[PDB]
Amino acid sequence: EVQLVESGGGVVQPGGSLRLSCAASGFTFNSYGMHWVRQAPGKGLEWVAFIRYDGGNKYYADSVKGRFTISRDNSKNTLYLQMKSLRAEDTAVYYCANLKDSRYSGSYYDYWGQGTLVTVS
Amino acid sequence: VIWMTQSPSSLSASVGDRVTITCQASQDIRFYLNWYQQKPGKAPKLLISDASNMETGVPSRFSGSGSGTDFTFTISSLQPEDIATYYCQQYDNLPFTFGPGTKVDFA
Amino acid sequence: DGYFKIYSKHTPINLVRDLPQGFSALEPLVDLPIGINITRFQTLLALHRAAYYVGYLQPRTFLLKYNENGTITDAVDCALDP
Amino acid sequence: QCVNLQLPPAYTNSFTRGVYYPDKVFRSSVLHSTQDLFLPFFSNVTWFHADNPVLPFNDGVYFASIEKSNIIRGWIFGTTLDSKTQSLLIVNNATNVVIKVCEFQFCNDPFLDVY
Ligand SMILES: *[C@@H]1O[C@H](CO)[C@@H](O)[C@H](O)[C@H]1NC(C)=O
Ligand SMILES: *[C@@H]1O[C@H](CO)[C@@H](O)[C@H](O)[C@H]1NC(C)=O
Ligand SMILES: *[C@@H]1O[C@H](CO)[C@@H](O)[C@H](O)[C@H]1NC(C)=O
Ligand SMILES: *[C@@H]1O[C@H](CO)[C@@H](O)[C@H](O)[C@H]1NC(C)=O
Ligand SMILES: *[C@@H]1O[C@H](CO)[C@@H](O)[C@H](O)[C@H]1NC(C)=O
């Protein structure tokens, strides 16, 4: 029932920008904080950013901080990630997820999307 | 930033063998640690939260324990379906961080 | 600040699978000096050998109307619309 | 003794619901402006049928129920929801409300058994 669907992936040039989105259904999207995670080919997972349930407080990893912006629309049940000044190192599969957490998000359940590939070339 | 590390980077084991994977935090994170298992082409799946709390639906052959900087994940009897990469993630302090991942091969 | 505050109200209702319209203010019930963090919660039901609703609070500015008897009878949610 | 007994969410409109007294000071015949944690007007509120999952607390919760049989007795509030941390347990019985904070080892699906 629970689904998370990423979109907006593709191929871009260095120094460019790209807007990713994640549609949500089957769960109370507007009740949960949401995270972005990325995985470069042949590499492990890298945590990108987090936004609170109300779309207020936002957090970023040092590798993307100052370049990327996280946002959401609770009326459209959609999570967004706006990337600017992209580099070759940003080539990765980007996932939206509701990560289980007893400290910040208060999430009891752990859900992930299918991921969307972004290539910088 | 709290950095995460894992040991070994990879291991080989056969069916019925006991598999132990070590995760370490750069700093004391109490018991706040998630263990994820990922197979090629798929999103990661959570097996354990809060160090020792097993996720519903996860086979009893899986376990974990530890505290502070020191955490261990164990498979008491490896099955052919358990060949995967395991990651450990700390959620004590933002930004959140994942370990490098430990790869399990079938020997 | 470590204090767990509860407000409440109790009325009859003649409507079915929904909450009623109209204004009603909830009064303070208890204020407990507990000093713990809360991030998750669950309901406790009595089962023998009903429905509930959950909404989340946000930091909002309200204009509250206190009547001549000191009870709040109306309000404006300032961030709702222009 | 513990006993081992997900659906898509339903939603309703909270038209002008969930307003509470911000403080204990008496006021009358006045329009007073206040900033606090309030439930936004006409928000989308999650509707459940007494379906009792663990929910996030976020910044605070507005809770309401409609019943004629006293099925909802109380709540559990906490973080880990296990012996690792202190948790708040609020329950009502036939004579009293009982509130405790302890390192409770809660059941996988807690409830009160009525004979
Ligand atoms: C509530 O949900 C409806 C769709 O069912 C949507 O049109 C409306 O904008 C939402 N309102 C809020 C505050 O999210
Ligand atoms: C409670 O919250 C504070 C502030 O985030 C944090 O520093 C503290 O470690 C938390 N304690 C527990 C038991 O969660
Ligand atoms: C205020 O209280 C008095 C009784 O003390 C009552 O007659 C009057 O109608 C009340 N006013 C309102 C607006 O309810
Ligand atoms: C409920 O499940 C737990 C965990 O597996 C188990 O320890 C407990 O004995 C079970 N309770 C009953 C009545 O089977
Ligand atoms: C309700 O709880 C109180 C406090 O523990 C207890 O003294 C009282 O007997 C309980 N009432 C019933 C009917 O169990």
Contact list in A for residue D53 (CB cut-off 8 A) is 108
Contact A102 B50 (CB under 8 A): yes
**Of D77, D52, D80, nearest in space to C41 by CA:** D77
For residues D50 and C51, the answer to whether their CB atoms sit within 8 Å is yes
Contact list in B for residue A68 (CB cut-off 8 A) is none
How was it solved? Answer: cryo-EM
Which chains reach chain C with 3 or more Cβ–Cβ distances below 8 angstroms? Answer: A, D
Domain with residue B94: its CATH number is: 2.60.40.10
Q: Does A97 touch chain B (CB under 8 A)?
A: yes
**Of B53, B51, B62, B52, nearest in space to B25 by CA:** B51
Give SS3 for A88: helix
**Of A30, A25, A23, A10, nearest in space to A74 by CA:** A30
Give the separation between CA D41 and CA B9, rounded to whole angstroms. 53
Tell me whether strands D55-56 and C40-48 are parallel, antiparallel or unpaired: antiparallel
Q: Does A27 touch chain B (CB under 8 A)?
A: no
Give the separation between CA C5 and CA C30, rounded to whole angstroms. 6
Which residues form the domain of B93?
4-106
Q: Which long-range contacts (CB under 8 A, 24 or more apart) does C10-14 make?
A: C13/D66
Q: Cβ < 6 Å from ligand 1: which residues?
A: A 74-75; D 43-44
For tokens 């609170």, what's the residue?
A52
Domain with residue A26: its CATH number is: 2.60.40.10
Domain count, chain B: 1
Positive or negative CA dihedral for A12, A92, B2, A83? positive
Q: Does B89 touch chain A (CB under 8 A)?
A: yes
Resolution in angstrom units? 2.4
Give the separation between CA D66 and CA C18, rounded to whole angstroms. 9
Which residues form the domain of A65?
3-120
For residues D71 and D50, the answer to whether their CB atoms sit within 8 Å is yes
**Of D52, A55, D20, A53, nearest in space to C41 by CA:** D52
Domain count, chain A: 1
Give SS3 for A31: helix
Helix and strand counts by DSSP (H, E) for chain D = 0, 10
Alpha carbon A101 to chain centroid, angstroms: 16
Residue A121, burial from CB neighbour count under 10 angstroms (0-12, 13-18, 19+): exposed
Q: Whose CA is nearest to atom 10 of ligand 2?
A: C37
Give the separation between CA D44 and CA D13, rounded to whole angstroms. 5
